[PDB]
Amino acid sequence: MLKIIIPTTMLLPMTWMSKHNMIWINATVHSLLISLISLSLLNQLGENSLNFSLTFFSDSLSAPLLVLTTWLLPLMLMASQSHLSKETTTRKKLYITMLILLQLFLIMTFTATELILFYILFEATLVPTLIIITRWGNQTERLNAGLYFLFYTLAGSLPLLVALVYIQNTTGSLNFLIIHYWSHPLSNSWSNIFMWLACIMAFMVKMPLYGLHLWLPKAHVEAPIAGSMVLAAVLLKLGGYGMMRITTILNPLTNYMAYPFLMLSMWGMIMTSSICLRQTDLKSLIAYSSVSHMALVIVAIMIQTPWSFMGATALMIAHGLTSSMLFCLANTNYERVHSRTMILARGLQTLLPLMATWWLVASLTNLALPPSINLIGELFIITASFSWSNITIILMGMNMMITALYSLYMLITTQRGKYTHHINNIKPSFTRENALMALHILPLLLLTLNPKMILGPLY
Amino acid sequence: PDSWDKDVYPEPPRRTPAPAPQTSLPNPVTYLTKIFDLLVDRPVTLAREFIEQQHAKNRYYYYHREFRRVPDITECEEKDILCMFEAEMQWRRDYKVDQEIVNIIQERLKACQQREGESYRQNCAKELEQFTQVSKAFQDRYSDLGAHYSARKCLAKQKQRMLAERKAAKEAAAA
Amino acid sequence: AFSAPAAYLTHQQKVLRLYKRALRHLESWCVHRDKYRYFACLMRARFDEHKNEKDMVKATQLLRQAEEEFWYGQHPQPYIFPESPGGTSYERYECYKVPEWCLDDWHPSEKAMYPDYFAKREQWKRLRRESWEREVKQLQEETPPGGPRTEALPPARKEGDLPPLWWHIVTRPRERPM
Amino acid sequence: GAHLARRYLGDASKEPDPLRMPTFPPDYGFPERKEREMVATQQEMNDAQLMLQQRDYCAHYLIQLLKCKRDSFPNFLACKHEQHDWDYCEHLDYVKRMKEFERERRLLQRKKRREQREAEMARG
Amino acid sequence: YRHSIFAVTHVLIPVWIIHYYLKYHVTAKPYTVVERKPRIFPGDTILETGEVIPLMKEFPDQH
Amino acid sequence: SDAPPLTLEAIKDRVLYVLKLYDKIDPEKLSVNSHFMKDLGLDSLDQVEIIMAMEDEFGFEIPDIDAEKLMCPQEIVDYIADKKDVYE
Amino acid sequence: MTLCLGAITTLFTALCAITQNDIKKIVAFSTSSQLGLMMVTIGINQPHLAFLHICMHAFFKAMLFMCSGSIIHSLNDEQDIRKMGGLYKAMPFTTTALIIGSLALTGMPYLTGFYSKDLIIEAVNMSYTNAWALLMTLIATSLTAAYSTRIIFFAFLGKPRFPPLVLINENNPLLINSIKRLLIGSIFAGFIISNNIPPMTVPNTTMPLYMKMTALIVT
Amino acid sequence: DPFINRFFKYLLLFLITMMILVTANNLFQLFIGWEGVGIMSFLLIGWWHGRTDAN
Amino acid sequence: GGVHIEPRYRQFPQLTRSQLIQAEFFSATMWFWILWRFWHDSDAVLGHFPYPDPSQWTDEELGILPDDED
Amino acid sequence: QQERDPWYDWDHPDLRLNWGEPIHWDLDMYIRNRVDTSPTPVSWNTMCKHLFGFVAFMLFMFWVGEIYPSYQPVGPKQYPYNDLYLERGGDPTKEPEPVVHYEI
Amino acid sequence: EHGHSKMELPDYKQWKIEGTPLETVQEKLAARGLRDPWGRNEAWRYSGGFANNVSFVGALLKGFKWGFAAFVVAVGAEYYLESQ
Amino acid sequence: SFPKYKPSRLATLPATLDPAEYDISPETRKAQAERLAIRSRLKREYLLQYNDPNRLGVIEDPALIRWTYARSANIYPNFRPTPKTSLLGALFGIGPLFFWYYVFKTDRDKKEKLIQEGKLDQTFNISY
Ligand SMILES: CCCCCCCCCCCCCCCCC[C@@H](O)O[C@H](CO[C@H](O)CCCCCCCCCCCCCCC)COP(=O)(O)OCC[N+](C)(C)C
Ligand SMILES: CCCCCCCC/C=C\CCCCCCCC(=O)O[C@H](COC(=O)CCCCCCC/C=C/CCCCCCCC)COP(=O)(O)OCCN
Ligand SMILES: CCCCCCCCCCCC(=O)SCCNC(=O)CCNC(=O)[C@H](O)C(C)(C)COP(=O)(O)O
């Protein structure tokens, strides 16, 4: 597992020793090579795991997330190349350094064979992203966004630390293998109820759970494009990964402690979906769509069935790719109009047809159109929920409706109709932006052919 | 085909009627099949002959892996991590093989339904019965375990089932 | 569409609009040309006896009552011309209307074809550039104090002058660009 | 239908419920009761795999109709005697159902007449 | 000339590949291609066995 | 489509053709520049019926605000030319 | 539930079509009523008859939109039937094809629509079902005949009602051949298909004479 | 129409999705066809993008 | 692909004899098909078997007894 | 926004707005792609009464038709082999009670 | 290559109310003391090939004559061929 | 005498049926003149910025900025706890949660009682 960690660290001296006009090229090329190395990890086995050492281990749940994390960095560099053109060389190197450090912490978090190391890296990721948001952000609200994104997170995560050390004092280990093998049931007690809450709330905040999601629209809207891509694609999935890992010590308590959360999701995924219907900002609409999809993932993890887990893994990968693509499209529009108001720039299919087809494919994947992996995750979670209770279908069913609706709304408001007359600076799409779009969307339609790669360890 | 075992996937002897034309009017289906044979099957057959002789020019073999039997979770100490590890791996392999057995029986059922045509409700009672048996056994073994299933949880489920069975047998005997 | 609207409608304008609506909806009702022509002449006459009504209170009670009558017998599915706002091809060709400034972003290889067009286009741009400086001054000197009162634009009054704010009226894409 | 008019406006008990016929024993009329006959056996009728709703007393004619249709394929009007035979047999079956309905109705009428006449005698 | 070449590149080539894909790869595994068994009527003979299904019960033929 | 590219001459000919079939105006008097209110002694209702006749002739509908101030056949022809964009 | 849904759908869509002024709207409501008839057929447990109706309706309804679009294009993008006058002679081939399609739609005997719609009415009459759904099916058949009459009469029989500059033109080989292929379909396909498929339901062999004639009488 | 090649491509896409719907043996394949015909109907109804009523 | 047809402006449009003969031919074929099918298959609308009468059937046929049997 | 004047020359012809005019709080509710409040030939309440009345009537009559089904004066179909016992479910090792049909 | 043949407008004095239902409209209108100023604007709808109308049943019977003749010839040929 | 048209929220009153436009008064005329004057000033400013050949960007609209700012960023500083706000927030944010909780809890309790009784017929229910 060091064969990926060491090159990612070596990305830093190479960036800092590069010529002033060769940083982007070297970073992109080397990062892409690292992503290629990540593919070897996928050849997972039906038995336990790839236990590389005492420190790191890989799994068919961790491998798709690792591959997506390594793949996301070249795209973030491509998206950041544009708006950082008038920026000093040292600060551009600092930005690339923040991205590399973020990737380094993320890669490490997944192998993270023990829960304390996982917690440390899980919280280490909070620093580079906060710096990215509060330094390279445009609006004046970014500061508030940063503060929210910080304290919410820590408010959920400091109790977890306590719980974690408590467990190591009772069981004697926090290694995930020993925890899984020596698992014991949780008795119905008040102390056990509060240990369950301390274990769950940290990951439930970062999903985010409906009601605890106020940080997300801010931190996504006022972040730069690379920050938004990494926040939606990977950082939201840390909560899901942690929930999938830690619920092995929470049975049979979860059988009824999950009721308040399931409700908050099953109703919440409706509410936020309806919020997308009345939105004056593209980034805010995409953020709320992220909230709805992660609400479905929360339901899947709380049900705790093999189909729920397969659907949740598939949906996490699919949502990461789709939401990154949507944010990149919105940013392509923004860098021309400088407004980020959805109603302002209209009729863009007439001026940018290839951007229009990119928008269509992104909306169709957000639509959960078969046989995309978005549909695969959606359907597995819906079937599992139906088995859990036949009434969930109503909520699930209606959610699908609203999703499609607002998705096509986003396509019709910005691409169709009549172009705005007074806007005359809509220059043709660059090769960089079209390449970014293709490099988002082709992996999705390539993953739809080999679903077992992203269906998790219960496949 | 010698590629798969007929006994595992049984097939009826496939009785077909013989062509008994009643009118001298020449049907189009037979002419169409002869021209299809001449224009499609012969080139495909020739290409397959070439490909098969090239494959025969280079023959090499691969082996199906053999797994020894290992003591299972019942004869394992409470905290003995190595024996739990091996018993868990063996249990997982057995779970996968059981899934494949259920898959085989389901393929049998589907093939019977398609083959028997309109009389499937009567001519596929055997496959339905064997699938019902296998489904009951599989549901008893592996249902309700959850996402974090293990050999210990399967053993606990089996233990409560056999406790209920022992209670029922004792009650019926002393009734 | 072209003419600037007024602050209100006078009595004659409202009467004429009612006359048009009534005739169009009657045509939508009685379809055949002879039937329509007969009932349209009857509509003209029944519209006509109060032509000379002098005092305005009776004339306003009249045409208000008529307005109510129109709503009742209008024909909830009236005929609409295909290119009219409710028509079946109202905005059919609106997606083919590309602005002229997009031509500035063409590649030089694209501009290699069509050289005469782009020469004439550059001539047009020069004309616009000079006319704009003249027209700002003209429209500033003619506008009444306190800002314009109506949406009306003065014409060009000198020899080489062009009407103020003409670039986006004459450079319309087309009615059917394709 | 007029039978609906009689049942749903007049006396319901005077006319049958179509769901539950017959309400009377087959031997109530006469003791001969010649049994119905099938020509199509189990095995060949199963092998023809007609349909579950087509596996009725007219099965033999349908078997021959399909056999002749298969045999004389291109000239797809060569089978008119066979289709007429099957269609007439189904006509006979429907007419026998008509007769079953009408026999049940008259049996019901006599039964009602018998009880009232008996009741009148009892009252006398 | 146009129709003859077109019927080669758009009809002949795809049917060649599909016939090869079905005959030598798909039917190599069991139950991939399943056909409803042909109907049997009284009086047919079978290629594999050679026997003849016994005729029917000679119902009273009239009209 | 397969529609002819109508020109100014055609528009003028058709406008005058429709006007001549308006019996309330004598055909031998009307001209391209003849005003309706004065030169032909027409009512406002006659003018609006004339606008209807032009609309039904040309297949499209002139809005009220633009129609109510069209007083010459040349003026109508020029408005139709502006709408259909027939420079020649 | 399926039977009731189909009955109310076919009735309501025929009732809406009976008074429309857009030709495409009328033909769309005709499609909706025929779909309602298909699900009525589903409700009386005759799936194969519904499939055969699907196949026949394909031919004649597609060719009916064919003719409608031919009229619209020849009339310079005019879709309202109030500006469609004497086209019986102006467009002879569109007229003959539309008449054939309308007769096929209304179940003219021994045509494409006969071999499906006729038996559908036959079977819905001879089955244990709702009385009200049967009534709505018959009324929907009558209304089908009625709006077919509406289109033919009001767009082909009167005096011309379209603008003076006449651009009527049928003489395009693409249009003519595309129409006539579906014409041959709408004339002979029902007979051919009905005589080539094996029997897969019991027929309604014997029936009251008035009930056998009900579809023709209602049309 | 300037985009007639696209129009033809769209019609072909609909035919392919409908054939997938008709020939489908399981429910997932039938859903693929089910949603394909729906999306292509959305794309062909709103053929003239600039018309609000089409959208 | 077709022929040249010019506008008329308030007159009947020109008609090629080809379209007239083709329309007339197809209408004639439709009516010939209707008449031919009606001639050779007349029962398809009329029916081939008479509808029996319930009143006509005898009591003995229906095995009905007027309170004599029991 | 649908009932604004379609003939005025707006700065935004599709949305029918002018640059600088105050925007309604619910503009995105009223965009000609969504809910419109244009006056209708019939009053709202009359339409509601009529629509509800038609639907209620059809429901009532469908239930009534369920109460009063329609059929032909016939008996049930007769199926030969013990009401087709073996070809519908099977179980050939139970020897079911034989049922025989009456010929007439 | 399009339809550019320099089409000319017909004579405007061609159109007359006589012999058309516009005459009946005129009679009914003058019975109440009025006149239609646009009668001749529409006369072209009753003048040329638009003068003759076809009934609905006449429209439905568009090719009945030749169909009937072909049916008679075919049935006669079948009658002659079968009786042999 | 004809039936009267009764307006509603989603079917408003037609302009030609508004008695206000027939109650003609002089202050109405001055109001209309002032409104059209404001509109003409705005149109003049927009067209002056719109036809300028030097401009190569977006004509910023303060009305659009005000709309979006009011819709998003002006809400909380103008919020006040009132009986209406408190009751509506409590209802719309709590009631659906407890309603769905009761529904799902009842459904699952019924299912569990049936399963413990064994009378549910879970035959072939393999994958969950
Ligand atoms: C705002 C967006 C979301 C934020 C987070 C919301 C999610 C957190 C909600 C916590 C989940 C449940 C908490 C406790 C669950 C225990 C089960 C209890 O609810 O049911 C009854 C519990 O009884 C009563 O409810 C006692 C508790 C009453 C007082 C506690 C306050 C409850 C609501 C407060 C919620 C406040 C949320 C925010 C706080 C910061 C059963 O009674 P009983 O069977 O006899 O005892 C069982 C427990 N034993 C066995 C350990 C003894
Ligand atoms: C996103 C913002 C959320 C803010 C934080 C929410 C998480 C709250 C979870 C509880 C916090 C503390 C949990 C303790 C960590 C686990 C350790 C543990 O389980 O030990 C318990 C100790 O249990 C406790 O001490 C729990 C006391 C909690 C004190 C802090 C209260 C926090 C808020 C209370 C009300 C709401 C709680 C959940 C709110 C959810 C978020 C809104 C029993 O051990 P012993 O005592 O040794 O064994 C019993 C025999 N002596
Ligand atoms: C089926 C459709 C519904 C039918 C019902 C509609 C009923 C409406 C008819 C009622 C009659 C009225 O107009 S109500 C009478 C209202 N008041 C007046 O008519 C006063 C003076 N009229 C004018 O000045 C006009 O402008 C005029 C002179 C005509 C032209 O002017 P020009 O000199 O500038 O052409």
mmCIF file of N, CA, C and O in Angstrom, chain J residues 22-40:
data_model
loop_
_atom_site.group_PDB
_atom_site.id
_atom_site.type_symbol
_atom_site.label_atom_id
_atom_site.label_comp_id
_atom_site.label_asym_id
_atom_site.label_seq_id
_atom_site.Cartn_x
_atom_site.Cartn_y
_atom_site.Cartn_z
ATOM 1 N N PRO J 22 -39.070 45.708 -10.819
ATOM 2 C CA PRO J 22 -39.055 44.789 -9.675
ATOM 3 C C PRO J 22 -39.598 43.423 -10.062
ATOM 4 O O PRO J 22 -40.573 43.307 -10.806
ATOM 5 N N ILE J 23 -38.956 42.384 -9.542
ATOM 6 C CA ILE J 23 -39.287 41.003 -9.863
ATOM 7 C C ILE J 23 -40.172 40.444 -8.762
ATOM 8 O O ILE J 23 -39.910 40.664 -7.573
ATOM 9 N N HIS J 24 -41.221 39.729 -9.156
ATOM 10 C CA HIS J 24 -42.115 39.112 -8.189
ATOM 11 C C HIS J 24 -41.350 38.122 -7.320
ATOM 12 O O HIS J 24 -40.414 37.461 -7.776
ATOM 13 N N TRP J 25 -41.750 38.035 -6.049
ATOM 14 C CA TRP J 25 -41.109 37.110 -5.120
ATOM 15 C C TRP J 25 -41.173 35.673 -5.623
ATOM 16 O O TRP J 25 -40.259 34.879 -5.377
ATOM 17 N N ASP J 26 -42.240 35.322 -6.332
ATOM 18 C CA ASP J 26 -42.439 33.977 -6.860
ATOM 19 C C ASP J 26 -42.296 33.936 -8.371
ATOM 20 O O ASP J 26 -43.091 33.281 -9.047
ATOM 21 N N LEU J 27 -41.312 34.642 -8.930
ATOM 22 C CA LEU J 27 -41.119 34.608 -10.375
ATOM 23 C C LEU J 27 -40.967 33.178 -10.870
ATOM 24 O O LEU J 27 -41.639 32.766 -11.819
ATOM 25 N N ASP J 28 -40.123 32.390 -10.205
ATOM 26 C CA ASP J 28 -39.873 31.023 -10.646
ATOM 27 C C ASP J 28 -41.086 30.115 -10.504
ATOM 28 O O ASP J 28 -41.064 29.004 -11.040
ATOM 29 N N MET J 29 -42.134 30.546 -9.798
ATOM 30 C CA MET J 29 -43.407 29.839 -9.857
ATOM 31 C C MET J 29 -44.153 30.136 -11.146
ATOM 32 O O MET J 29 -44.880 29.273 -11.648
ATOM 33 N N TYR J 30 -43.999 31.346 -11.680
ATOM 34 C CA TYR J 30 -44.816 31.853 -12.777
ATOM 35 C C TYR J 30 -43.860 32.133 -13.928
ATOM 36 O O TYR J 30 -43.369 33.253 -14.055
ATOM 37 N N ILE J 31 -43.561 31.129 -14.748
ATOM 38 C CA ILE J 31 -42.562 31.320 -15.797
ATOM 39 C C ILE J 31 -43.021 30.801 -17.152
ATOM 40 O O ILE J 31 -42.194 30.590 -18.046
ATOM 41 N N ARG J 32 -44.320 30.573 -17.314
ATOM 42 C CA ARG J 32 -44.933 30.038 -18.527
ATOM 43 C C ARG J 32 -44.566 28.580 -18.751
ATOM 44 O O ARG J 32 -45.120 27.944 -19.655
ATOM 45 N N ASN J 33 -43.660 28.024 -17.949
ATOM 46 C CA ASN J 33 -43.383 26.597 -17.908
ATOM 47 C C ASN J 33 -44.053 25.943 -16.714
ATOM 48 O O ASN J 33 -43.914 24.732 -16.518
ATOM 49 N N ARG J 34 -44.793 26.713 -15.929
ATOM 50 C CA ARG J 34 -45.260 26.303 -14.615
ATOM 51 C C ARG J 34 -46.644 26.905 -14.405
ATOM 52 O O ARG J 34 -47.321 27.272 -15.370
ATOM 53 N N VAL J 35 -47.080 26.973 -13.147
ATOM 54 C CA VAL J 35 -48.447 27.380 -12.848
ATOM 55 C C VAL J 35 -48.734 28.759 -13.423
ATOM 56 O O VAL J 35 -47.946 29.700 -13.269
ATOM 57 N N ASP J 36 -49.857 28.871 -14.126
ATOM 58 C CA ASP J 36 -50.318 30.130 -14.681
ATOM 59 C C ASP J 36 -51.719 30.432 -14.170
ATOM 60 O O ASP J 36 -52.520 29.531 -13.908
ATOM 61 N N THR J 37 -52.010 31.722 -14.037
ATOM 62 C CA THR J 37 -53.260 32.187 -13.455
ATOM 63 C C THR J 37 -54.101 32.949 -14.472
ATOM 64 O O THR J 37 -54.903 33.805 -14.100
ATOM 65 N N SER J 38 -53.926 32.652 -15.754
ATOM 66 C CA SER J 38 -54.671 33.361 -16.786
ATOM 67 C C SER J 38 -56.161 33.098 -16.612
ATOM 68 O O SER J 38 -56.551 31.970 -16.297
ATOM 69 N N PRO J 39 -57.014 34.107 -16.779
ATOM 70 C CA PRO J 39 -58.457 33.878 -16.650
ATOM 71 C C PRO J 39 -58.955 32.872 -17.674
ATOM 72 O O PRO J 39 -58.489 32.829 -18.814
ATOM 73 N N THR J 40 -59.911 32.064 -17.256
ATOM 74 C CA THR J 40 -60.465 30.996 -18.063
ATOM 75 C C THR J 40 -61.867 31.351 -18.541
ATOM 76 O O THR J 40 -62.556 32.156 -17.909
#
